[PDB]
Amino acid sequence: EFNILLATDSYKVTHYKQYPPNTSKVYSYFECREKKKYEETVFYGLQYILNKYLKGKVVTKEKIQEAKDVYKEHFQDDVFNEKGWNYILEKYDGHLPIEIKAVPEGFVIPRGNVLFTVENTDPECYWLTNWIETILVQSWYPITVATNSREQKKILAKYLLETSGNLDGLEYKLHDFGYRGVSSQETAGIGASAHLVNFKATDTVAGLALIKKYYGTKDPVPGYSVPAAEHSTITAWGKDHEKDAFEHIVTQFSSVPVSVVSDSYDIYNACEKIWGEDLRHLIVSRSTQAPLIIRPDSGNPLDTVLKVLEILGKKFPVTENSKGYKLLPPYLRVIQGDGVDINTLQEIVEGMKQKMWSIENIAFGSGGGLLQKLTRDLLNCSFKCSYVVTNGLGINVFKDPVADPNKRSKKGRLSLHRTPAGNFVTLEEGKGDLEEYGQDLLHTVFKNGKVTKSYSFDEIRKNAQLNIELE
Amino acid sequence: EFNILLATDSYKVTHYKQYPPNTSKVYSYFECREKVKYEETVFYGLQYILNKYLKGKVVTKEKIQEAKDVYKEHFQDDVFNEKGWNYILEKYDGHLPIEIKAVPEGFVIPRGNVLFTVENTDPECYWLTNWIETILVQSWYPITVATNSREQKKILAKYLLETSGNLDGLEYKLHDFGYRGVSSQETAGIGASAHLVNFKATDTVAGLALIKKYYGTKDPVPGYSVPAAEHSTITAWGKDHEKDAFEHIVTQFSSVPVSVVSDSYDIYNACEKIWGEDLRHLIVSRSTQAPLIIRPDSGNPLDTVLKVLEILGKKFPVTENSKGYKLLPPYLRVIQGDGVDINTLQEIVEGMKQKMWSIENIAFGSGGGLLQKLTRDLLNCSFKCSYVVTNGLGINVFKDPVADPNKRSKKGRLSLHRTPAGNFVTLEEGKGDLEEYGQDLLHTVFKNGKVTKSYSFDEIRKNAQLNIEL
């Protein structure tokens, strides 16, 4: 079972001995620090952490003794704050005397703004605020995935609109294939849920269970998939029977959309000769609601996409849409699910536009690129102490390393506000109290062991909408 | 609760309908596919996956109905194989009819070799082999962490040996600070455990519990830490009181080693004036077993390390060791815990060598670089089908994409062997049965819901040692 006393960085165990004596309050904040592009971030994921790990009775006699035993060996010394944890157990029935205030989930906030703050609600628990830094800071991951997914949605929307005149199907143009490429089952659920903030296309099922348990949607599920082959379901038929495999699978799934990986031996032969001649009759008869979706999976992603399109365009009846771009017949589409990250996504749609192919023809699958190839320094997600009270006097505190101005942290009590032009500003030094900038956008979401405000996944999606979607 | 019927890629739900009719066997393997870096990998972490997710009764009526209801909405259609999963429930009491063979954990094997194989033990369950690809393939992460961690140990060993004449303290020279920088609690435990295959220094507490539960050590714990400050324990004292913070912390931890972050405002001032002058008397009185470990945390990592060392070497009594390199007194050390990954680690130690500083002086902390900035394509970890039986006839199967030879997979029944020169070779096409290469080095580790062979964390560590350690 999860033990909050064993869910921190080891050195934090020793910090209760290092703060200034007579310190009654430690107040800390999280930002995605600005760096001298990712100019705005989606706040998403805190609610999951609050519910799974921080709420309710998280301290027990047994958990205290377990931690004491572990730390005695780990440190080869007794340095553990057994008294402090006992106090929380006795006074608060093991609920954390902590208050967390946060921007609403799904909100899209420029870099360098406070997104949440943390403080102890009992003077004895000054040490507790930063104890939970480690667990709260992991919110960087759903924030970063949601943000990066949204940034790719902006690219897709831009090119789709330019090449087609609309945004139909935008929410299915980036399909999560990342389940096998992430570091764990838990990460898979979290990351998949973050992508779903922006899109509805996914193969990472763990996402759906997380959303149902922690957020909830009006619809039965937040995300969807369609039948698709993998290489094993093609190669199992034998090298000489790729066509038999193709035929069997599109016939099995004749009335729904079906993706068929086509590069097992020779992607270009498969498109030109197998799909384009041998089995053409099984493709052109298909419904508009059930296209064949041809899937290349190797080679340079842009070059292979263009070559596949060029091949298919000469074997199938292509039209020119009202924008002047080429469109495959409705029963035939393509998905590129290899080598896709935000960078190659951009290169591919731009290459397509250059060769006069509509973005309507294509969708993208991304796995590692989407859910794994991201770190905490992408958005400089960071948690810092900005305010303490020592001997009954509050002091504004911060770091400001001489060699790196980018690492300077904010000072004092913080609040988030709308600017007169409708943007965001973070007020420092408790200046929000002057009430010159309207209401604080942070809300209490956790206080003394209870989750005090929650958002549905539907609200989060609404908050995270693109401007182009609003317009 | 965890539901293995909901722990696969969506499309695999539809694959039982896509295999050739009358397929009775699907056999698949995992390798770190070959492409000058990462020529060999540490096999680690499958044991965790077998135990936490695959073993025992993993199928119930409840789980089957839950999967049915989710998939009906997820596909907007009924395509889920209720019957196949019920068959497993009713025939095998929900235990998976699967056999898995694997190289021993901790083993170091060149790229391009079979590391584990998977096959169904019941003909009705031909579809099960690749259903669990997704979960098994996540072994890439502990493999990749362990491997990249060990490569860093190699660098440290080489430089420590050259600048000091020995390897004392090697296993404490790379310290896991990645708890906050990974994507989840589960990842934290897995990744930290993997680092611990090579080192004993960690702040990622989650790793200890995983190791204790799934592997085991003779010693009470696999990894250790020491007291250390963070910016909040310095800055809370106020900008004008950095000295008071330093003095309090080192006095509180006077007889154990203590790391103190010294760059909150001005690292060079803190080293030269606060540590080097105002508080010097509190440092030079410390035990060899309880050094002050000064921690810079910003600026160019190499440049800052060198300047910190130059500063300290002028304020403190420096010796020259037997190899001719400079050594801080034993009560004073440095840890660089910012911007450290395998590339910058190499750059720092090489730069220290050029300025004649022993690697004895320093340790490194790595977080994101150690546990998060890694992907499945670093070692090309990959799971593929190589052998099927259909209509009673065994077929050797494979992919071979025209535009990418590096993605070609292996054919047929596989086995792993020692060569006459004592290296590893993977035999394809069932050629291991010809018995020209001696015994298959893979062992059966899972069969029909039971874990059938396992390794302690002490043995895994022994298997993973460096040559120079041997």
Author numbering:
A (entry chain A): 8 to 43, 53 to 487
B (entry chain B): 8 to 42, 52 to 486
What does the published report state?
NAMPT functions as a homo-dimeric enzyme that catalyzes the rate limiting step in the primary salvage pathway for NAD synthesis, the transfer of a phosphoribosyl residue from 5-phosphoribosyl-1-pyrophosphate (PRPP) to nicotinamide (NAM) to produce nicotinamide mononucleotide (NMN). Crystal structures of NAMPT in numerous ligand-bound forms have been reported. These structures consistently display a NAMPT homo-dimer with two essentially identical active sites at the dimer interface. Typical NAMPT inhibitors were found to occupy the portion of active site responsible for NAM binding and a tunnel-shaped cavity extending from the NAM binding site.
In addition, A217 pushes the H191 imidazole ring away from its normal orientation by 30°, rendering this part of the tunnel less compatible with GNE-618 binding. Compounds with a bulky phenyl group in the core (series A and compound 12) were less active on all G217 mutants, while compounds with a narrow more flexible linker (series B and compound 11) maintain much of their potency on the more conservative changes of G217A and G217V.
